[PDB]
């Protein structure tokens, strides 16, 4: 059996300016199987209110998703990405670049 | 909105070619049925065309053009068998059939040696009913129904000896009246000029 | 492999009474479906069933209600029946449904009556008829006639029986009934058949011959009041001997 | 009119994880999800405003039928696939089928299945004949060709009723799916050139470096087209800066039929 591990991008939906209200983005994409636990993280804590989009079809059988969650960017709060599959030892953690 | 449309009743001879068509009006095609229905009996698969083009099944070949939105039956060298109603039934959209109304086939048989003749047939002690066999005559004699209420005549009907291989068709008319006679039985009807009525008594 | 079995074949009802008609199959089909064919139209699906635990209303739901018992049966039920509800219903099914070239296999069909009043339901009135002598010096061929004459409803099976076994050959019978009223909706019905043997074969007076009709009326449930006796669904028949 | 495209697809797990559906069916219009069943909700759902507002409720209540039955066909599928496949614990079963409106006018159409998330069975309605990775995609292809007249009926509605369904769908939602929002594009250095686009609908876009007007797409590193998720998409494209010599560098970005190029000082 051929497993995919996912990838990981994250990204906020306009240009990120401080103090500026905008949406942090983390786009889950190719993997496969379909099981797969998404989290954002402010500081290293999971931020409650995260919405993410409905499990998606790719052409090449992969599955992606949308997780994103409303920020304001400031210049000492740090955001990323917590990501676990079955491709996956242990949760892989993606950090916003910025 | 969506119409299904095939001829009520088609007659053709045993032997001969018959074309049934079946046109419709629908919102989507996936795909266009024929079935046979024998008089009592349930509808079976006959065919099933959703491209353009002829197939072909024994005797039966189906036709469909898609563009035209218009199917037909073709059925060639009839046999007395094929006498049955034929449905056309098309898929929609959404995968519904919508049934056509049928057509019932009427299979004329070739009467090689046509006697026409009208018999009287025996009473029965246990009715008080006349009873005449208007028997023997071809094919495309017609039997009218009674314009006296007080008889009765039924159509006609084919009869299949396979021992001899012998067909025939016949229509029987009956009354309890006084004044009904087998030489009157059948007067409202067009029989044959040399139509045999044996002497009575 | 029977195929698709429903049943009953015939059915008498009065206006308001309640029926359920059976459905199964054994071809191992997950889609299974109730019509109803009337007189000048296209079958019309009444219910149906995509597979094993879904149902839904066809084109002529109201009325009726249906139950995927299991996989193979799929009953169909009138609660009150109603005249407009005088058809011939059929049960189908299919392996799957949205297939697009599956094709439909039907039952054997229910023919169904239903009635305001039962004192217009009559049994059949049987008579034979012997050859003429005339057609068996003519054609060497000899034609009896079986008249059933005044029942009501259109509920019966006519056979021939030469020698205690059913025939079928030499046999034609109409059909369709004759409405010996035709203005009359209500009108009782006639029905002849014809059974044609070689003058030879007639002329054997061991020769036994008996046109058989079987009558689907009322049952022990069914009230009656009438005068007359009750029209049950019962056998009629009438014989006639070879003569020599 | 640009290039349009629906299709259906189709999941299914054997064993899944508690909670999680054994059947999902999920279609799409370009990258928009229309409609959605899964085997929890047992119900067919819009998941597109103007698919819900102009599709009766007859045509959610039939479809909500018939995605039962398919939900139960691919649960038989599956289980005769992974019986013979001889495989033990959770596999999963897909399909895809769809069509595609070109610009020109062109139709095309597809339709095939997947086990474990590999190519199991691929169609091809003008051959009308399957293609099999395996011996097991074997014994299946030689099953379903035997069935000539479903072959048929599959080439008839991708290249008939997928497209007309298509083209129902594209005038449904019009205002979404044939809008035009041109890109946002800039540069910045991170040493590489990032060339950055946002903002812009449909997703289709190519975005590619220049350098002294001649294409070196070796040494272009391409971003994906993400989603924003507001409607509108974001890519890049990244080339590396030669630190010994200068050069021309120039982005190219197109989109919707309209050609940009940032020249860089
Ligand atoms: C809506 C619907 C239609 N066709 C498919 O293959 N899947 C679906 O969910
Ligand atoms: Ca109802």
């Not at chain 3, 058809?87 to 169904?112: M, N």
């Not at chain 4, 039955?69 to 399909?95: A, D």
Request: glycine share 6%; with cysteine; aromatic share 12%.
């Amino acid at each position: 059996m051929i497993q995919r591990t996912p990838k990981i991008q994250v990204y906020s939906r306009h240009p990120a300016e401080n103090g500026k209200s905008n949406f942090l983005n983390c786009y889950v994409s190719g993997f496969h199987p379909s099981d797969i636990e998404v989290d954002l993280l402010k500081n290293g804590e999971r931020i409650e209110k995260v919405e993410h989009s409905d499990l998606s079809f790719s052409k090449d059988w992969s599955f992606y998703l949308l997780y994103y969650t409303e920020f304001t960017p400031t210049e000492k709060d740090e955001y990323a990405c917590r990501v676990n599959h079955v491709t996956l030892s242990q949760p892989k953690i993606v950090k916003w670049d910025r | 909105g969506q119409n299904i449309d095939q001829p009520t009743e088609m007659t053709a001879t045993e032997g001969a070619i018959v074309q049934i068509n079946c046109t419709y009006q629908t919102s989507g095609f996936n795909g266009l049925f024929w079935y046979q229905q024998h008089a009592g009996e349930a509808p079976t698969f006959l065919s099933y065309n959703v491209l353009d083009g002829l197939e072909e099944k024994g005797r039966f070949s189906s036709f469909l053009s898609r563009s035209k939105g218009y199917s037909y039956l073709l059925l060639k060298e009839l046999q007395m068998k094929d006498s049955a109603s034929y449905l056309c039934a098309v898929k929609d959209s959404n995968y519904q059939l919508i049934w056509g109304a049928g057509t019932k086939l009427i299979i004329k048989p070739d009467i090689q040696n046509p006697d026409p003749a009208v018999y009287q047939l025996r009473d029965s002690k246990s009715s008080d009913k006349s009873v005449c066999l208007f028997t023997d005559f071809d094919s495309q004699t017609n039997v009218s129904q009674s314009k006296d209420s007080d008889v009765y005549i039924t159509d006609k009907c084919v009869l299949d000896m396979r021992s001899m291989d012998f067909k025939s068709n016949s229509a029987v008319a009956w009354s309890n009246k006084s004044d009904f006679a087998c030489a009157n039985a059948f007067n409202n009807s067009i029989i044959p000029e040399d139509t045999f009525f044996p002497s009575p008594e | 492999n029977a195929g698709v079995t429903q049943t009953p074949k015939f059915q008498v009802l009065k206006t308001g009474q309640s029926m359920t008609l059976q459905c199964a199959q054994d071809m191992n089909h997950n889609s299974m479906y109730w019509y109803r064919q009337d007189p000048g139209m296209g079958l019309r699906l009444i219910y149906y069933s995509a597979s094993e635990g879904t149902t839904d209303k066809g084109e002529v739901p109201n009325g009726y209600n249906v139950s995927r018992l299991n996989k193979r049966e799929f009953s169909l039920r009138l609660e009150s029946a109603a005249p407009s509800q005088t058809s011939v219903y059929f049960c189908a099914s299919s392996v799957w449904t949205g297939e697009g070239s599956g094709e439909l296999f039907f039952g054997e069909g229910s023919r169904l009556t239903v009635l305001e009043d039962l004192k217009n339901v009559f049994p059949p009135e049987v008579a034979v008829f012997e050859p003429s002598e005339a057609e068996i010096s003519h054609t060497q061929k000899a034609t009896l006639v079986c008249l059933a004459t005044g029942f009501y409803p259109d509920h019966v099976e006519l056979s021939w029986w030469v020698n205690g076994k059913e025939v079928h050959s030499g046999v034609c019978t109409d059909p369709q009934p004759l409405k010996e009223q035709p203005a009359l909706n209500d009108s009782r019905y006639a029905l002849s058949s014809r059974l044609r043997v070689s003058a030879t074969f007639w002329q054997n007076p061991r020769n036994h011959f008996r046109c058989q009709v079987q009558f689907y009326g009322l049952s022990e449930n069914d009230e009656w009041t009438q005068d007359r006796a009750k029209p049950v669904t019962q056998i009629v028949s009438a014989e006639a001997w070879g003569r020599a | 009119m640009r290039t349009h495209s629906l299709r259906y697809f189709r999941l299914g797990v054997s064993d899944p994880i508690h909670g999680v559906p054994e059947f999902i069916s999920v279609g799409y219009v370009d990258s928009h999800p229309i409609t959605t069943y899964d085997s929890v909700t047992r119900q067919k759902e819009p998941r597109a405003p103007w698919m819900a507002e102009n599709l009766a409720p007859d045509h959610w209540e039939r479809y909500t039928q018939l995605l039962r039955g398919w939900q139960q066909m691919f649960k038989v599928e599956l289980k005769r696939l992974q019986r013979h496949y001889n495989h033990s614990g959770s596999h999963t079963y897909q399909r895809m089928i769809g069509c595609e409106l070109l610009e020109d006018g062109s139709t095309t159409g597809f339709l095939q299945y997947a086990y474990d998330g590999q190519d199991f069975l691929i169609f091809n309605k003008d051959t009308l004949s399957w293609l099999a990775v395996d011996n097991v995609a074997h014994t299946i292809k030689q099953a379903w060709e035997a069935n000539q007249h479903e072959l048929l009926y599959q080439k008839n509605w991708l290249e008939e009723e997928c497209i007309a369904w298509l083209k129902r769908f594209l005038e449904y939602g019009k205002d979404t799916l044939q809008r035009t929002e041109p890109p946002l594009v800039r540069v910045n250095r991170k040493t590489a050139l990032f060339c950055k686009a946002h903002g812009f609908y449909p997703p289709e876009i190519y975005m590619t470096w220049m350098k002294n007007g001649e294409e070196i797409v070796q040494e272009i590193d391409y971003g994906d087209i993400l989603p924003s998720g507001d409607g509108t998409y974001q890519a890049w494209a990244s080339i590396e800066l030669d630190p010994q010599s200068s050069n021309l560098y120039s982005c190219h970005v197109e989109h919707s039929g309209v050609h940009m190029v940032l020249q860089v000082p």
